[PDB]
Design a protein around this ligand. Structure first.
Ligand SMILES: [Mg+2]
Ligand SMILES: [Mg+2]
Ligand SMILES: [Mg+2]
Ligand SMILES: [Mg+2]
Ligand SMILES: [Mg+2]
Ligand SMILES: [Mg+2]
Ligand SMILES: [Mg+2]
Ligand SMILES: [Mg+2]
Ligand SMILES: [Mg+2]
Ligand SMILES: [Mg+2]
Ligand SMILES: [Mg+2]
Ligand SMILES: [Mg+2]
Ligand SMILES: [Mg+2]
Ligand SMILES: [Mg+2]
Ligand SMILES: [Mg+2]
Ligand SMILES: [Mg+2]
Ligand SMILES: [Mg+2]
Ligand SMILES: [Mg+2]
Ligand SMILES: [Mg+2]
Ligand SMILES: [Mg+2]
Ligand SMILES: [Mg+2]
Ligand SMILES: [Mg+2]
Ligand SMILES: [Mg+2]
Ligand SMILES: [Mg+2]
Ligand SMILES: [Mg+2]
Ligand SMILES: [Mg+2]
Ligand SMILES: [Mg+2]
Ligand SMILES: [Mg+2]
Ligand SMILES: [Mg+2]
Ligand SMILES: [Mg+2]
Ligand SMILES: [Mg+2]
Ligand SMILES: [Mg+2]
Ligand SMILES: [Mg+2]
Ligand SMILES: [Mg+2]
Ligand SMILES: [Mg+2]
Ligand SMILES: [Mg+2]
Ligand SMILES: [Mg+2]
Ligand SMILES: [Mg+2]
Ligand SMILES: [Mg+2]
Ligand SMILES: [Mg+2]
Ligand SMILES: [Mg+2]
Ligand SMILES: [Mg+2]
Ligand SMILES: [Mg+2]
Ligand SMILES: [Mg+2]
Ligand SMILES: [Mg+2]
Ligand SMILES: [Mg+2]
Ligand SMILES: [Mg+2]
Ligand SMILES: [Mg+2]
Ligand SMILES: [Mg+2]
Ligand SMILES: [Mg+2]
Ligand SMILES: [Mg+2]
Ligand SMILES: [Mg+2]
Ligand SMILES: [Mg+2]
Ligand SMILES: [Mg+2]
Ligand SMILES: [Mg+2]
Ligand SMILES: [Mg+2]
Ligand SMILES: [Mg+2]
Ligand SMILES: [Mg+2]
Ligand SMILES: [Mg+2]
Ligand SMILES: [Mg+2]
Ligand SMILES: [Mg+2]
Ligand SMILES: [Mg+2]
Ligand SMILES: [Mg+2]
Ligand SMILES: [Mg+2]
Ligand SMILES: [Mg+2]
Ligand SMILES: [Mg+2]
Ligand SMILES: [Mg+2]
Ligand SMILES: [Mg+2]
Ligand SMILES: [Mg+2]
Ligand SMILES: [Mg+2]
Ligand SMILES: [Mg+2]
Ligand SMILES: [Mg+2]
Ligand SMILES: [Mg+2]
Ligand SMILES: [Mg+2]
Ligand SMILES: [Mg+2]
Ligand SMILES: [Mg+2]
Ligand SMILES: [Mg+2]
Ligand SMILES: [Mg+2]
Ligand SMILES: [Mg+2]
Ligand SMILES: [Mg+2]
Ligand SMILES: [Mg+2]
Ligand SMILES: [Mg+2]
Ligand SMILES: [Mg+2]
Ligand SMILES: [Mg+2]
Ligand SMILES: [Mg+2]
Ligand SMILES: [Mg+2]
Ligand SMILES: [Mg+2]
Ligand SMILES: [Mg+2]
Ligand SMILES: [Mg+2]
Ligand SMILES: [Mg+2]
Ligand SMILES: [Mg+2]
Ligand SMILES: [Mg+2]
Ligand SMILES: [Mg+2]
Ligand SMILES: [Mg+2]
Ligand SMILES: [Mg+2]
Ligand SMILES: [Mg+2]
Ligand SMILES: [Mg+2]
Ligand SMILES: [Mg+2]
Ligand SMILES: [Mg+2]
Ligand SMILES: [Mg+2]
Ligand SMILES: [Mg+2]
Ligand SMILES: [Mg+2]
Ligand SMILES: [Mg+2]
Ligand SMILES: [Mg+2]
Ligand SMILES: [Mg+2]
Ligand SMILES: [Mg+2]
Ligand SMILES: [Mg+2]
Ligand SMILES: [Mg+2]
Ligand SMILES: [Mg+2]
Ligand SMILES: [Mg+2]
Ligand SMILES: [Mg+2]
Ligand SMILES: [Mg+2]
Ligand SMILES: [Mg+2]
Ligand SMILES: [Mg+2]
Ligand SMILES: [Mg+2]
Ligand SMILES: [Mg+2]
Ligand SMILES: [Mg+2]
Ligand SMILES: [Mg+2]
Ligand SMILES: [Mg+2]
Ligand SMILES: [Mg+2]
Ligand SMILES: [Mg+2]
Ligand SMILES: [Mg+2]
Ligand SMILES: [Mg+2]
Ligand SMILES: [Mg+2]
Ligand SMILES: [Mg+2]
Ligand SMILES: [Mg+2]
Ligand SMILES: [Mg+2]
Ligand SMILES: [Mg+2]
Ligand SMILES: [Mg+2]
Ligand SMILES: [Mg+2]
Lengths: 137, 122
RNA sequence: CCGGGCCUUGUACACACCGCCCGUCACGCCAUGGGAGCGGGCUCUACCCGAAGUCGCCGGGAGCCUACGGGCAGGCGCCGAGGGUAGGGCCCGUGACUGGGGCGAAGUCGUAACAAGGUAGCUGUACCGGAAGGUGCGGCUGGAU
RNA sequence: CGGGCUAAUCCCCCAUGUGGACCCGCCCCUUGGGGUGUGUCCAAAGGGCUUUGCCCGCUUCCGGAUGGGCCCGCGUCCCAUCAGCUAGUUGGUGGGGUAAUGGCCCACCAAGGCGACGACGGGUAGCCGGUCUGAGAGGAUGGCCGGCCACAGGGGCACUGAGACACGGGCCCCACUCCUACGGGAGGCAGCAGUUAGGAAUCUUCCGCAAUGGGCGCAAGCCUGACGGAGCGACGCCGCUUGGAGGAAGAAGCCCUUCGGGGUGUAAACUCCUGAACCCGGGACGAAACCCCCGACGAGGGGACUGACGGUACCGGGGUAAUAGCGCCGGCCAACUCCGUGCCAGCAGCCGCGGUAAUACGGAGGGCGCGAGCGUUACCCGGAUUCACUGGGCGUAAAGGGCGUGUAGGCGGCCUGGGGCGUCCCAUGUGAAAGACCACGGCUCAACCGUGGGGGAGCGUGGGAUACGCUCAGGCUAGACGGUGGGAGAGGGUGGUGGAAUUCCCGGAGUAGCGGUGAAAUGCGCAGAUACCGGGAGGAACGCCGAUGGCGAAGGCAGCCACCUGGUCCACCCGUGACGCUGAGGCGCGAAAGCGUGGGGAGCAAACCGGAUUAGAUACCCGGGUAGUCCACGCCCUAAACGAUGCGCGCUAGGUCUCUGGGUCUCCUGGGGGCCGAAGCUAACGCGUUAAGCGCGCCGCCUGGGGAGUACGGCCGCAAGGCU
């Protein structure tokens, strides 16, 4: 496997469309540190460090919107969108000034930094930048 | 394609193919007629259009379509041309300019005179 | 066999099969290529001669200045723009004739493909043929029933 | 040319050496930096005023200051149809030379240097600030102004010199032209105007040093085609005028009409008012310094001369209704009717207008838009999201390489530590000014110009943080590889081999037709065929099994046997411990046809002959029949080589069928082969755990159709022909 991060993200985005109460991912302090952000902002319900037939994991507990009428009653997504940015094919790096603001302020972009993973706003608050992990809403 | 490839082969800034080569990047080239006559067009039209074949200071020699009605063009007539083809007449890519050189504008013409080198009556 | 009705199917037809369309030969205009060659540009190699000029040796059988263990003139040499001989490389233009191609069209021959287009079609090659094309070997279905 | 004379801030020797140059030694430093000591070398210039002092100069040595030279790092266009280049070529020792490193030059030793990170060759072009376009990233561009570079008719050279290898200096050569008294000489606008030629086209052979700036001089002053202005040109931008107010239910003319009317039209006429230009008077800012007076030639304070533009702008008084032209009117795209015409004469940027009722040509009426402008052509960006980093795509619309193996490269799973390359933050130097951007200020505005303000990317210096990338080291086992035991299979190769049928030969028997078609005919048959029996020879393909099946990366592989060998799957969860994916190049495989050599040759079968159908039938059907289809060794390397779907991994309901495994045997789990379908995608048809769904990595590929997979060049090949 090339990029677990997008894979991680991918796994999520793949279940949120099918409406899974939870889902699993191979573990890594970095993946976790990420996920740490993804409930403190509220896209997820949180994660717990599970463990499959001998191997560590991160069953993420998923959050979705409310049931609806009309013909398509399926609950709107919390994470409307989640796509990788900086990649192995094209590593993407930003200075504090050139840090984007997701969807006019309704979304975020997880950033790896010398001062821990941050959100688009947390960095600007801490006054730094780094490898744009992804943008999500 | 891969970003790598775009790094290796980049993308091709396709250029333009000029449509008036006989000009040599110039807006107007003088010529001297050689075959003053008429030319039928391809379908769906029918007529006898007024063509002018001209040799140029650019060395070339091209058909130039004579606009308007009634002219004064015959062999050895000093002339000037301009860019502009005549869709229906293959073999013609450029225009001639009335009221210039051994070419005179249209007679008893009152409208859009500029495009037909014809000064002002009373 | 003629006309019509409904369902389905295929269709490159919609001016609707009195459709659409392919090829050779005919005529007209343009354009590229091949071609015994000719014409010019650029560039490379080797060799002969070689101006001014710096540089290196000699300055005596021998002129001048002395600043006389020297200086100038003057002589020899290496390099040397370039000129010449010869042979290669590349590109542009031009050329009897020639090969196909494009557009025009209201001609001539036939009617290959589009319907089971009347031999299912296409395809690679190979052969043949006035031409679209036919056929042999194998392959795909983008083949109707 | 020569002979002879003379001055100096010209040239030469000697002396004096603060000082500076060189050698050798030594301290420090660290590349040839500074200090130190002995031997050696070297300076010079006078002129003028009011005269024992001043000013200007002259000599050396240190430093400052500015202007430079050389060197480095990263960045800088198009073609790979340029893939190899290189002998001063790369390095060294030693000398020359320069202000100085250097192969910049010579000699000798060595054999080395550059290149898919695109060397070498070709084409093009002067780069940057900026300029235009652009939402931006980006594209195009480099005139004007500012900086740097390179050239001074085409080439070479050195002298002078602080400095050049010098545009209006010099030496020579070439090309060109001119002068001439015919023996011989000269010249170089790419300086300001100007001529000639070429072109679509680019101006005055004007005024002046008043300003600014420059050289020379103590100063006065001189030179000044730099510079300041005038003129020409609608070339672009800005500003202004061709008038303003009143003015009929509305003159004439002109266009339309359904003949009542409609439109031009507040437009004019005429009334009043205002007053562009043109007349006179006045008339500048720019111009305060150098210099002269006192003082001290200085600080400071007083004194005059000077204006090219120019009698111009500008100020005052007075005062004339005083140019409108162009494009467009079928849709895009704002603006409508009438005649003429009749696929004719014509417009056209695209789709398209016209063939007797044209909103599309021409004219006119009227109308639309700008307005001393209006339009066209040319070229650049835009729209073009149509080379897509932002920001596209490859099942059928153009595009997956025929398939594999593998180099470079790109990319890379969990955990810990060091370093701190990318990466991020702060500080800081540079990032000239002009311009762009905000504020304001002067020409009565604006265009133009001035003042201040406000940033960045990029790289140089120091410090810091460590998430991800990377690197060094230590562990792990979830990817991969492997061990034990098995299983299925037209996987591939060699050698043997088994039966049915077709063809011919031989033998027996037998008679009037067989064969063939939609029907017929050629053809074969009394020289005994067809159908039968028997024996023999030869070649090729393997009936049922067999199938929506299986294997293979692909093409492809099918009677039976054995041998040699590959890939692959399942289980146990034994070992190595990221060893991995991808793969431009390269290499190998590659159905049929085709080629070469030597065999083989029954059936079939291109070309060929014949018989028929047809108007014709160089074809479809029939009778013969050569290569070839078969084997061996070589090539050939293409295709509807298809799933028109590249390979690996991870994530995303299931249902039914089938192949082969494992289990516990109801059923559960692995791997393949089909079918319908969750969500989702998709232009639709369709795909959907064998994706064409959500994703990550890497390769190939597309950029309208035809021309054309053609030409040229290069490679491959015996050729046909293949690749690009
Ligand atoms: Mg991005
Ligand atoms: Mg017509
Ligand atoms: Mg001419
Ligand atoms: Mg004439
Ligand atoms: Mg044009
Ligand atoms: Mg007009
Ligand atoms: Mg019927
Ligand atoms: Mg019915
Ligand atoms: Mg039907
Ligand atoms: Mg018919
Ligand atoms: Mg012809
Ligand atoms: Mg030719
Ligand atoms: Mg020649
Ligand atoms: Mg010789
Ligand atoms: Mg010589
Ligand atoms: Mg000499
Ligand atoms: Mg020579
Ligand atoms: Mg030579
Ligand atoms: Mg010569
Ligand atoms: Mg056919
Ligand atoms: Mg037919
Ligand atoms: Mg047919
Ligand atoms: Mg064929
Ligand atoms: Mg022939
Ligand atoms: Mg045939
Ligand atoms: Mg067949
Ligand atoms: Mg096949
Ligand atoms: Mg197929
Ligand atoms: Mg079909
Ligand atoms: Mg004397
Ligand atoms: Mg001395
Ligand atoms: Mg020098
Ligand atoms: Mg050299
Ligand atoms: Mg040697
Ligand atoms: Mg490189
Ligand atoms: Mg390239
Ligand atoms: Mg340029
Ligand atoms: Mg220009
Ligand atoms: Mg300049
Ligand atoms: Mg030169
Ligand atoms: Mg010169
Ligand atoms: Mg010249
Ligand atoms: Mg010269
Ligand atoms: Mg000179
Ligand atoms: Mg120079
Ligand atoms: Mg000159
Ligand atoms: Mg001149
Ligand atoms: Mg001329
Ligand atoms: Mg001028
Ligand atoms: Mg002056
Ligand atoms: Mg002055
Ligand atoms: Mg004086
Ligand atoms: Mg005087
Ligand atoms: Mg002078
Ligand atoms: Mg100037
Ligand atoms: Mg009025
Ligand atoms: Mg006056
Ligand atoms: Mg003044
Ligand atoms: Mg007045
Ligand atoms: Mg008036
Ligand atoms: Mg217009
Ligand atoms: Mg119009
Ligand atoms: Mg109409
Ligand atoms: Mg418009
Ligand atoms: Mg309209
Ligand atoms: Mg018109
Ligand atoms: Mg159309
Ligand atoms: Mg009409
Ligand atoms: Mg104006
Ligand atoms: Mg364009
Ligand atoms: Mg637009
Ligand atoms: Mg864009
Ligand atoms: Mg697209
Ligand atoms: Mg296609
Ligand atoms: Mg394929
Ligand atoms: Mg590798
Ligand atoms: Mg990693
Ligand atoms: Mg680490
Ligand atoms: Mg670092
Ligand atoms: Mg600036
Ligand atoms: Mg103001
Ligand atoms: Mg400013
Ligand atoms: Mg800005
Ligand atoms: Mg900065
Ligand atoms: Mg730093
Ligand atoms: Mg670390
Ligand atoms: Mg790496
Ligand atoms: Mg390790
Ligand atoms: Mg495993
Ligand atoms: Mg294994
Ligand atoms: Mg036979
Ligand atoms: Mg017998
Ligand atoms: Mg028998
Ligand atoms: Mg069968
Ligand atoms: Mg099968
Ligand atoms: Mg174990
Ligand atoms: Mg171990
Ligand atoms: Mg591989
Ligand atoms: Mg083959
Ligand atoms: Mg074969
Ligand atoms: Mg042969
Ligand atoms: Mg032969
Ligand atoms: Mg043979
Ligand atoms: Mg035979
Ligand atoms: Mg036959
Ligand atoms: Mg015949
Ligand atoms: Mg016949
Ligand atoms: Mg025949
Ligand atoms: Mg036969
Ligand atoms: Mg043969
Ligand atoms: Mg043959
Ligand atoms: Mg063969
Ligand atoms: Mg053969
Ligand atoms: Mg190939
Ligand atoms: Mg198939
Ligand atoms: Mg497959
Ligand atoms: Mg294909
Ligand atoms: Mg793909
Ligand atoms: Mg079983
Ligand atoms: Mg299955
Ligand atoms: Mg389905
Ligand atoms: Mg659905
Ligand atoms: Mg998509
Ligand atoms: Mg599969
Ligand atoms: Mg591939
Ligand atoms: Mg084209
Ligand atoms: Mg094309
Ligand atoms: Mg081909
Ligand atoms: Mg060729
Ligand atoms: Mg070819």
């Amino acid at each position: 496997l090339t990029d677990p991060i997008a894979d991680m993200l991918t796994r999520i985005r793949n279940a949120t469309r099918v409406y899974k109460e939870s889902t699993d991912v191979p573990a890594s302090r970095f993946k976790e540190e990420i996920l740490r952000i993804l409930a403190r902002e509220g896209f997820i319900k949180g994660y717990e460090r599970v463990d499959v037939d001998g191997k560590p994991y991160l069953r993420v507990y998923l959050k979705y919107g409310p049931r609806r009428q009309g013909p398509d009653p399926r609950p709107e997504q919390v994470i409307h969108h989640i796509r990788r940015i900086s990649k192995p094919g094209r590593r993407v790096y930003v200075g504090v000034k050139e840090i984007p603001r997701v969807r006019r302020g309704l979304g975020i972009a997880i950033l790896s930094t010398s001062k821990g993973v941050l959100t688009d706003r947390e960095a600007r608050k801490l006054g730094v930048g780094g490898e744009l992990i992804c943008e999500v809403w | 394609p891969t970003i790598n490839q775009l790094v290796r082969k980049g993308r091709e800034k396709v250029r333009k193919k000029s449509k008036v080569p006989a000009l040599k990047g110039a807006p107007f080239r003088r010529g001297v007629c050689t075959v003053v006559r008429t030319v039928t067009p391809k379908k769906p039209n029918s007529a006898l259009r007024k063509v002018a074949k001209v040799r140029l200071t650019s060395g070339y020699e091209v058909t130039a379509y004579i606009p308007g009605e009634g002219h004064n063009l015959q062999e050895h007539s000093v002339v000037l041309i301009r860019g502009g083809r005549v869709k229906d007449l293959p073999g013609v890519r450029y225009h001639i300019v009335r009221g210039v050189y051994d070419a005179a504008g249209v007679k008893d013409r009152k409208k859009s005179r500029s495009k037909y080198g014809t000064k002002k009556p009373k």
